[PDB]
From a paper:
To investigate the mechanism of GSK002 resistance further, we determined three high-resolution crystal structures, one of GSK002 bound to catalytic core domain-only, one of GSK002 bound to the catalytic core domain containing the Ala124 substitution, and one of GSK002 bound to the catalytic core domain with Thr125. These two substitutions were chosen for study because they were the most influential in reducing GSK002 IC50 in the study of diverse HIV isolates. A model predicting GSK002 activity using the top four most influential amino acid substitutions (K20R, A124N, T125X, where X ≠ T, and K188R) performed well under cross validation, where the cross-validated mean-squared error decreased from 8.49 to 2.26. The protein structures were quite similar, with RMSDs ranging from 0.09 to 0.13 Å in pairwise comparisons. However, the azaindole core of the bound GSK002 ligand is seen to shift in position by ~0.5 Å, depending on the identity of the substitutions at residue 125, along with movement of the difluorobenzyl group by almost 1 Å. Substitutions at residue 124 could affect ALLINI binding or the catalytic core domain–CTD interaction. Substitutions at 125 may also affect ALLINI binding. Overlay of the catalytic core domain•GSK002 structures on the IN•GSK1264 structure suggests a further mechanism of resistance. Larger substitutions at residue 124 and 125 would create a steric clash with the polypeptide backbone of the IN CTD, disrupting the inhibitor-mediated interaction. Thus, the larger side chains in the resistance substitutions appear to either clash directly with the IN CTD or displace the bound inhibitor sufficiently to result in an inhibitor clash with the CTD.
During the early steps of HIV infection, IN catalyzes the initial covalent attachment of the viral cDNA to host cell nuclear DNA. The catalytic core domain (residues 50–212) adopts an RNase H superfamily fold and contains a D,D-35-E motif that binds Mg2+ or Mn2+ ions, which mediate DNA cleaving and joining. IN function is assisted by the cellular cofactor lens epithelium-derived growth factor (LEDGF/p75), which binds tightly to a site at the catalytic core domain dimer interface. An additional class of IN inhibitors, the allosteric inhibitors of integrase (ALLINIs), act at a second site on HIV IN.
Residue numbers in the entry:
A (entry chain A), B (entry chain A): 56 to 138, 149 to 188, 193 to 209
C-alpha cells in the first residue's frame, strides 16, 4: 500500500515491552525494548522513526496508545497523521526471537538479532531491500 | 564513497553521551543518547544499525571504542569489518541541537529533533533522500 504508512504496537515478553513498528508496504521492522508501555516512550520512538523514514501515517491495533499529550506532540511536530501483513510480520518476529533467545543474555539483544534476520530474509527481495526501493521510487 | 561505510563516534553534552553514526556517502545520521560510553552500548547500537541498513564497514575517530569483546561479537555476528564529511555532519548536528534545545525537557528529545531536521534538510536532495537512493541503486 502507501509508502508513508507504518503500524506500531507493543508486545510483551519476559515482563518487558517490545515496541514494534512495521512499514506496511514492505514488511520492514524497527523495534526497541522499552522500560514501560507509556505515551512518553511511544512519542520518543516516533520522533526517532520519523527522522529516519518519511512517516506520513501511523496505524495501531490499540487506539488508546496514541492519546497522550506526548504522542500528539510528537505527531504534530513531525507532521504525522492517524488512521494480514502486520499480523504476519509480528508473528514472524516473535518466532525468530524464540529461535535466537539463548544466544544472548538480554532480551533486547535477541530482539535486535530477530529484527536483523527478519529484515535481511529474501522472500525475491528482503523487507530491507523493498523499503529502500519503495521509498527511493516514491522520491522520483 | 562506498555505500556500506559508516562512521561512529561519541560526543558529550550536559553530562550525557550521544552516539552518532554517519552514513559517509550520504551524510545521513542516526543517533542515540546512551547512559555511558561503554563497549556494550556501542555493540547494541551496532546491532540495531546493521538490522536497518547494509552495514559493511565502520570507521571511528577513536579506535579504542571498538576493542571490547561485546563490540567484536556484534561485528562478527552482523558481518561487519573495521577500517571532511563526518566532521561537517557532526558540526551541523551539535549546532541544530543548540538551536532546538529549549523546545524540550530532555536532551534525548532535542537530539532526535536535530537528527530529523538534519536528515530532512535539502542541500538538491536531503541526506535522508540520498541514503535511500544510494542503497536502492547499489541493490540494482
Ligand atoms: C551482555 C553481553 N556481553 C557480551 C557480549 C559479547 C561479549 N560479552 C561479554 C561477556 C563476558 C563474559 C561472559 F560470560 C559473557 F557471556 C559475555 C554480548 C553480545 C554482543 C553482541 C552480540 C551478541 C552478544 C551475546 C550475540 C550475537 C549478536 O551480537 C552481550 C549482549 O548484550 C549487549 C548487546 C547489550 C552487549 C547479550 O545480551 O548477551
Ligand atoms: C517529557 C515530555 N513531556 C511532554 C511532551 C509533550 C507533552 N508532554 C507532557 C507535559 C506535561 C506537563 C508539562 F508542563 C509539559 F511541559 C509537558 C514532550 C514532547 C514530546 C514530543 C515532542 C516534543 C516534546 C516537548 C517537542 C517537539 C517534538 O516532539 C516531552 C519530551 O520527552 C519525550 C519525547 C521523552 C516524551 C521532552 O523531552 O520534553
Ligand atoms: C505502541 As504500545 C505503547
Ligand atoms: C497522534 As499520532 C497521529
Ligand atoms: C562510539 As563512542 C563509545
Ligand atoms: C569490531 As567492529 C568491525
Amino acid at each position: 500500500c502507501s509508502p508513508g504508512i507504518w503500524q506500531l504496537d507493543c508486545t510483551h515478553l519476559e515482563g518487558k515491552v517490545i515496541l514494534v513498528a512495521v512499514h506496511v508496504a514492505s514488511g520492514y521492522i524497527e523495534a526497541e525494548v522499552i522500560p514501560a508501555e507509556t505515551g512518553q516512550e511511544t512519542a520518543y520512538f516516533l520522533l526517532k522513526l520519523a527522522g529516519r523514514w518519511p512517516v506520513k501515517t501511523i496505524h495501531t491495533d490499540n487506539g488508546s496508545n496514541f492519546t497522550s499529550n506526548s504522542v500528539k506532540a510528537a505527531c504534530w511536530w513531525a507532521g504525522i497523521k492517524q488512521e494480514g501483513v502486520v499480523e504476519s510480520m509480528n508473528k514472524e518476529l516473535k518466532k525468530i526471537i524464540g529461535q535466537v533467545r539463548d544466544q544472548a543474555e538480554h532480551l533486547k539483544t535477541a530482539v535486535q538479532m530477530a529484527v536483523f534476520i527478519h529484515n535481511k530474509k529474501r522472500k525475491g527481495y528482503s523487507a530491507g531491500e523493498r523499503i529502500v526501493d519503495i521509498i527511493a521510487t516514491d522520491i522520483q
